[PDB]
Amino acid sequence: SMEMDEKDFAADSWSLAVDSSFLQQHKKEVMKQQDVIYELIQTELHHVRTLKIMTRLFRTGMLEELHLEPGVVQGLFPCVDELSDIHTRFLSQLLERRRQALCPGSTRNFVIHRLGDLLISQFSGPSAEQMCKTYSEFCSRHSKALKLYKELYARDKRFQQFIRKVTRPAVLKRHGVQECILLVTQRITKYPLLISRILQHSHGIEEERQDLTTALGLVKELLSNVDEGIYQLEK
Amino acid sequence: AIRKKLVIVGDGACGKTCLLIVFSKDQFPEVYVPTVFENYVADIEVDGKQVELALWDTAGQEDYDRLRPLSYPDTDVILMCFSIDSPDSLENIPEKWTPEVKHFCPNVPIILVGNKKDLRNDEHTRRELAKMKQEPVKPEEGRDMANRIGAFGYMECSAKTKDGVREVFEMATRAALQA
Numbered sequence A: 001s002m003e004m005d006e007k008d009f010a011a012d013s014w015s016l017a018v019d020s021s022f023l024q025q026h027k028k029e030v031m032k033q034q035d036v037i038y039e040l041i042q043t044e045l046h047h048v049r050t051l052k053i054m055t056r057l058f059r060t061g062m063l064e065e066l067h068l069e070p071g072v073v074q075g076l077f078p079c080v081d082e083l084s085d086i087h088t089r090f091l092s093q094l095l096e097r098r099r100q101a102l103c104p105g106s107t108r109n110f111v112i113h114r115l116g117d118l119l120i121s122q123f124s125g126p127s128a129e130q131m132c133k134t135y136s137e138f139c140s141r142h143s144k145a146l147k148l149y150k151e152l153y154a155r156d157k158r159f160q161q162f163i164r165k166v167t168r169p170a171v172l173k174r175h176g177v178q179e180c181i182l183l184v185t186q187r188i189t190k191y192p193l194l195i196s197r198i199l200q201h202s203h204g205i206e207e208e209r210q211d212l213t214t215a216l217g218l219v220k221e222l223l224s225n226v227d228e229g230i231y232q233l234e235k
Numbered sequence B: 001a002i003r004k005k006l007v008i009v010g011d012g013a014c015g016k017t018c019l020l021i022v023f024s025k026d027q028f029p030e031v032y033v034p035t036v037f038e039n040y041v042a043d044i045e046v047d048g049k050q051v052e053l054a055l056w057d058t059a060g061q062e063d064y065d066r067l068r069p070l071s072y073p074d075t076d077v078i079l080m081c082f083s084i085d086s087p088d089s090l091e092n093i094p095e096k097w098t099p100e101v102k103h104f105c106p107n108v109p110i111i112l113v114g115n116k117k118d119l120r121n122d123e124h125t126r127r128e129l130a131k132m133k134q135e136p137v138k139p140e141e142g143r144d145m146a147n148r149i150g151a152f153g154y155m156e157c158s159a160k161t162k163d164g165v166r167e168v169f170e171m172a173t174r175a176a177l178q179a
Ligand SMILES: *CC(=O)Nc1cc2c(cc1Cl)OCO2
Pocket: A019, A021, A022, A103, A104, A105, A106, A109
């Protein structure tokens, strides 16, 4: 995670992130809609950060510090490179839409008027197919990844050393190996919750209400296919 | 310190997300209540024992029967939530949530939690329920359900006023510690 984005999403809401003189020039319904859009981006930023801890800290650390079979590392972190590319691209698009909406002379005051188009692109066509296949694979290998982790922690003294050492920082308190895997599986089921609450405050422009309704239907369709494609593998 | 895992289950809009947020922040969010909960690791000292309590929510998973069980591995305590303003959410406890929680988490203690206890004296809630030939969940109905499902105990809280929230999570820690 880069300092610039961490600071932009440091506040608890959009109403606290923007200057108070800017907030006061907006209608309450705009403040409410922007509060949920900001939470969608802030949680996408945290999600991409969870995936970076898995690839760079845990996965790469095991390859460069331990003598484990690379097949063992693949069992511990399935599809993490693929998941990292999908969500890093999606976050990139959300952050550019926020930057485009910035008030000139400000790096914090913005109001995003269009979001539905961006959500339709992400959850439709080849983009949705790649997410469905990747999440169906990740979630089918989720239990085996936890069992492999627990076996390595209970049998290998060097693996225990590595884990105790990299997870020592306070910033990693809720981001251990098993916490990262559950955080990733649970991410997809947050999108309908975030998009339905955004939609509830997007009745001003009618094209936006429809684009958000289409995006909502597309996410639920993706979750349904991911859920149908799951078949838990064993160690 | 010892690490224990908590998962909260219950129907959508039974207040489970609100309950986790209010405990993990220590107050009712004054400016904005988040839509979602990611995870949280609370440092709890109960009866002289220091515990790391990892908090997890199942909101968003209620319609996905193959995804939802991925939340259950290694759970030490389950908060089985229902809303006191929704008598129907209490009816779904013994025939939907309990068979699933006992199948995936056998021997894991369950606390039956009645959320939104402040709505018991809310005139608008009583009026809305009276139209559907109903009334808010009486305390003895919650105790009778907890008894019927073999729960570890019955507790009531209000995430809006913060009453009973700390006691629920301290009790869940004690229940997770028992082996
Ligand atoms: C366009 C814009 O957002 N200008 C701006 C800049 C600052 C503050 C308020 C506004 Cl409206 O407060 C400090 O900087």
